[PDB]
Amino acid sequence: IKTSMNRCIHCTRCVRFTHEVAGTSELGITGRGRDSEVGTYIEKLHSSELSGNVIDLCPVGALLSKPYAFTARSWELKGTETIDVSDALGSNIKVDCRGTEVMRITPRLNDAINEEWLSDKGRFQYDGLKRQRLNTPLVKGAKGLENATWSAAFDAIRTAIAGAKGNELKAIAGKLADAE
């Protein structure tokens, strides 16, 4: 969470969220009159895993997303409505993309599953979609895993399966594998 409290109109959406929904009860209106200010009176870091939702709840950009800081403007992004595989809730999300890059992930309204809230992991895991990515087929050799074409990898898999028979073939599915 990035803070520009100078831009803060004193609604209480962040405080009400932190109390009723998040339940960490960290934010409050400290002060009286015009110099009243919003935030933890002590130096504290927001501990809830629903912390990202205050950014969306903030109408006037006083609370903003630090990972998504100064990177793009709203009009530049194409939004596609998809679901979050971070956990089995299947939170409905809108992925905003510029070109070939995912820029930010925000929730969608679905009273059935996620009212309008998104967990921090789902919200901020798009960063790991740009790192340690697999782009090409790799076949192992004496020099290690090396670049190979699709045909060569399939040939190696065929030569391997030829040896195995019956229950010697084993499949392990992952957390993010899809039904198809």
């Binding site: 004193h10 009286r32 009159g33 009243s36």
Partner: protein, 430 residues
């Protein structure tokens, strides 16, 4: 009490009798002065009888509202739905011109406690809280001693005063805030949160302290009610005019020969009050620039209006002001009205809780504009802008502190625009 002329209240007609502390303010003196006389009977007569007697007396509410006390008390629920009822006495007396409540708390503690008993029985409140200003440590000590004495003699508690009624009284104190005098903000403060007013569409009679039906009344109304039931509603009604019946405590302050707190019947002429009790204006009646009649919240009145103005609720409403509290402030020709009104604007900027947008922002805006006008930095159109901003604040806030911030500035614009224009032009000229 004569319909033609009002004034010159006699000692026999004064409710608050040791207001000046010439006698023992504690229980021995209170009993010798007529306190706790026959409270058993008055309480035993039933809540309905008390409500009708208060309604017939015509007692309107001291503290600024002016709302009829009997009707407000009758809004309380008759039968419990599982929620107890509470009485909270607003002894928070924060108001820039008002000092009257402090004398009652320090010199007539037992009248207030007995009144709390009477009003709690009239409204069916099991428990009562006396909110006191945090600055009033000694006054709080006096009130607490009165409460302890009343508990000791059985005047309070179960079977209070010998009647089959149960009432417990507590003394609670704030930490200093003008906003905590408002009914809902006081309840929030006593609950334990910030003293920020609650939106009124839920009303305190419906839902109040701890979610239970409550009524907030001033110390003066609570203190005058028992003697109203003793002396008689007709006696209370005789003094004032129609719809404005009782006597009220007038605190004269400012540029007067003798600043005094005094009790007088309402509908006395302001000139008569100032000349008789205050000793006259410093330098004579000729030496008047303006007079703030009802504390700082209400608009000020110029000398010309102060000539024929009568000290009443409805009449001051007709004179584009109000008798919020009988806190009359007198200014000489020497006084700079601009600086005093700027100080009031600073007061309201300091006392805003900051909850709603119009008060939180416009009160600071008003203070800034008044500060520039105090030096002549502003233009001539700035006065019209100031009027427009005051209109913007009024009516669009959660509580009446926005209105109380707007009103003094509006009064200054309305009655002393000439002096502001003079100051603005001369600074440009010189």
């Amino acid at each position: 009490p004569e319909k033609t002329t009002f004034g010159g209240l006699r000692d026999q007609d004064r409710i608050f009798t040791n207001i000046y502390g010439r006698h023992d303010p504690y229980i021995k003196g209170a009993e010798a002065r007529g306190d706790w006389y026959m409270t058993k009977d008055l309480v035993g007569k039933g809540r309905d009888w008390i409500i009708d007697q208060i309604k017939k007396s015509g007692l309107r509410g001291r503290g600024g509202a002016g709302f009829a006390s009997g009707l407000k008390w009758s809004f309380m629920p008759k039968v419990s739905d599982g929620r107890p009822s509470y009485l909270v006495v607003n002894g928070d007396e924060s108001e820039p011109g008002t000092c009257k409540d402090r004398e009652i708390m320090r010199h007539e503690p037992h009248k207030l406690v007995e009144g709390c008993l009477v009003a709690g029985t009239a409204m069916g409140a099991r428990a009562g809280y006396i909110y006191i200003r945090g600055e009033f440590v000694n006054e709080r000590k006096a009130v607490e001693r009165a409460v302890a004495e009343a508990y000791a003699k059985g005047y309070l508690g179960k079977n209070a005063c010998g009647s089959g009624v149960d009432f417990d009284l507590f003394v609670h104190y704030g930490a200093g805030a003008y906003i905590c005098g408002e009914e809902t903000a006081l309840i929030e403060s006593l609950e334990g949160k910030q003293g920020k007013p609650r939106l009124k569409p839920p009303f305190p009679a419906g839902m109040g302290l701890y979610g239970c039906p409550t009524t907030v009344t001033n110390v003066e109304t609570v203190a005058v009610s028992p003697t109203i039931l003793r002396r008689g509603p007709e006696w209370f009604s005789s003094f004032g005019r129609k719809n404005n019946a009782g006597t009220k405590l007038f605190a004269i302050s400012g540029h007067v020969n003798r600043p005094v707190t005094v009790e007088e019947e309402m509908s006395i002429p302001l000139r008569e009050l100032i000349e008789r009790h205050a000793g006259g204006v410093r330098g004579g009646w000729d030496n008047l620039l303006a007079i703030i009649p009802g504390g700082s919240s209400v608009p000020l009145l110029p000398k010309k209006m102060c000539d024929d103005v009568i000290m009443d609720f409805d009449a001051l409403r007709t004179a584009q002001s109000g008798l919020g509290t009988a806190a009359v402030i007198v200014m000489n020709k020497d006084t700079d009205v601009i600086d005093a009104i700027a100080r009031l604007s600073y007061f309201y900027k300091h006392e805003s809780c900051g909850q709603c947008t119009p008060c939180r922002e416009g009160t600071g805006w008003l203070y800034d504009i008044m500060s520039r006008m105090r030096k002549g930095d502003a233009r001539l159109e700035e006065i019209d802008m100031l009027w427009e901003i005051t209109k913007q604040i009024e009516g669009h806030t959660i509580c009446a502190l926005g209105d109380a911030a707007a009103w003094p500035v509006q009064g200054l614009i309305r009655h002393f625009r000439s002096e502001m224009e003079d100051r603005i032009k001369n600074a440009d000229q010189q």
